[PDB]
């Protein structure tokens, strides 16, 4: 009964990621960040995620992670904004920054 091992979309229950997949970027999986619109996000970095829909082409504008371009990551099921896919960087080349409070943690 591994009780807190997967992350689902809080809105619809789509399978998104796993506690096992948390990635400490610059020493911490958690990054508290603000966009140009002044919205605060508690971002959890994951090496891997699924069940998302990545919108458009990458942009480096206002990237919170040096060397990485982002794409908006929506829940592929309900279209809720869950965070961003990061690419074009180094070690790793790619990862997901997901908004912690938009995910529900629960058993495998
Ligand atoms: O890593 C990341 C992931 C993406 C994330 N971003 C960028 C971003 C935007 O970025 C496009 C954009 C940015 C700025 C403007 C207009 N300016 C002009 C001067 O500054 C204030 C208003 C228009 C469009 C537009 C809307 C939301 C976000 C958002 O959440 C972020 O910040 N860092
Ligand atoms: Zn959803």
């Amino acid at each position: 009964a591994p009780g807190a091992s997967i992350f689902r979309c809080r809105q619809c229950g789509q399978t998104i990621s796993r506690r096992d997949w948390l990635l400490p970027m610059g020493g911490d999986h958690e990054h508290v960040v603000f966009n140009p619109a002044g919205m605060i996000f508690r971002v959890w970095c994951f090496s891997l995620a699924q069940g998302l829909r990545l919108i458009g082409a990458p942009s480096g504008e206002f990237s919170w992670f040096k060397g990485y371009d982002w794409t908006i990551a929506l829940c592929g099921q309900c279209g809720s904004h869950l965070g961003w896919h990061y690419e074009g960087g180094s070690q790793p080349q790619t990862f997901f920054g997901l908004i912690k409070d938009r995910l529900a943690e629960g058993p495998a």
Side-chain angles (χ1 to χ4, degrees), residues 1-65 67-86 88-99 101-108:
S5 96
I6 78 154
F7 293 97
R8 288 181 185 286
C9 172
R10 177 179 169 174
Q11 295 316 315
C12 75
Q14 175 89 314
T15 316
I16 301 297
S17 197
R18 303 188 66 99
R19 184 159 278 280
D20 282 352
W21 296 349
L22 281 168
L23 178 62
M25 288 291 301
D28 196 344
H29 71 251
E30 188 172 85
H31 298 250
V32 180
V33 295
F34 293 100
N35 67 9
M39 202 167 345
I40 197 169
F41 302 94
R42 185 204 292 258
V43 166
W44 279 17
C45 302
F46 292 87
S47 291
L48 191 45
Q50 59 177 283
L52 298 164
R53 187 157 66 78
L54 303 188
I55 309 298
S59 172
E61 292 178 359
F62 303 111
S63 185
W64 296 312
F65 296 103
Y68 293 98
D69 311 309
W70 49 264
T71 51
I72 296 157
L74 306 184
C75 177
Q77 181 155 269
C78 74
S80 174
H81 177 219
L82 295 192
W84 307 266
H85 185 242
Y86 288 94
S90 314
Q91 186 161 46
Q93 284 177 320
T94 74
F95 67 100
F96 298 83
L98 298 186
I99 305 154
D101 48 288
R102 297 197 193 173
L103 304 172
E105 192 178 3

